[PDB]
Curated annotation (Swiss-Prot):
One of its GO terms (molecular function) is GTP binding. Its main location: cytoplasm. This is T-cell-specific guanine nucleotide triphosphate-binding protein 2. The gene is Tgtp2. It comes from Mus musculus. Monomer, homodimer or homotetramer in the presence of GTP. Forms higher order homooligomers in GTP-dependent manner. (Microbial infection) Interacts with Toxoplasma gondii ROP18. It is found in: Cytoplasm; Endoplasmic reticulum; Golgi apparatus; Parasitophorous vacuole membrane. (Microbial infection) Phosphorylated by Toxoplasma gondii ROP17; the phosphorylation leads to disassembly of IRGB6 (TGTP1/TGTP2) polymers into monomers and dimers. Phosphorylated by Toxoplasma gondii ROP18.
Amino acid sequence: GPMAWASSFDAFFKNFKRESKIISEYDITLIMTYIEENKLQKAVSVIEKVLRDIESAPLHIAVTGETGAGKSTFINTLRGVMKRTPYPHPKLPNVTIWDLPGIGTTNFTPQNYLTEMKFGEYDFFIIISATRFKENDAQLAKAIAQMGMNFYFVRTKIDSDLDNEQKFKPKSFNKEEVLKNIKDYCSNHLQESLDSEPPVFLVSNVDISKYDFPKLETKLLQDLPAHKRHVFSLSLQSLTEATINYKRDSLKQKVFLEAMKAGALATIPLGGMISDILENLDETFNLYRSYFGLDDASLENIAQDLNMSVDDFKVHLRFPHLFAEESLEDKLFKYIKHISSVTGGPVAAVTYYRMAYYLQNLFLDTAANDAIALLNSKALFEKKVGPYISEPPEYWE
């Protein structure tokens, strides 16, 4: 009883990368304590409080740097698009990317710049440069860290410098040597002023899949408070498998907690059929489609590149057909048996909410696999219908 539901709870959250956990290990420890003491109502009120903090958590990101750093293109690419300027995210009103003028552009000291730019409103600072980070940049970072906050040095316009070098020396172009020289110069000069060797993230302003942008996103996740990881995961653009999987895992944890909130303690059965639960979940499912870029509007462009209609293209995606007919409820019985033999399942006494949980979990895993397929839509289809059953040799194809 009590001891077994705490182990399922523990075993569920053990399955996730450390930087993706939306509750802290203290939260988990508290919740497990109450479950083990047979205080499930107390455990539920903790989960409710956690979920309220998660759902209302705002995200304010300060991007500080000079105008030559392409700050505008950087900010638009984050959002999928002497005074600070806000740029709300187009899909998430509670996310705001702020354009902060370069400290060198102003004439403030670091401490005065921070107070002028309202440093307490932000979750972290991005210090951006298209060139090298000056000693004033290092002084700013030092102040930010003294305020107990986080900063990240981002060197942008990497694609422009590689292009110039490539056109300069087409036959001896060494991509990795350019990157190493750029990063080392930036690192070595920040190390002299700053107490520790700060990481420097090399990025393209127009393509967040490239260079160090993936490692940046992982470090930002890892440094944020646990409850802020969900809204930050949602704010990412679903353009890499890692980013898609960050969203998948964050939403899977959230629906697990929602299941316990709604169904750990309810006891008169709600009744209905699986078809009724699915009807009730229809708007939730559409919200999930929107998180993953699977809504009809987003699927139009991709279907065109494949000379298909959205209806055609959706034949080859799994989420539309997940529930059909071998009956559905037998498929679900076996699914539940598989999962709950492994991680115990959700803490949900109410069948309605137990099944809502599994239906949402399944939809989330499917939507994420579909989104991953969208990254390489044409090639996947062309390989699928074409004859070859195996992968091509390395540099031939």
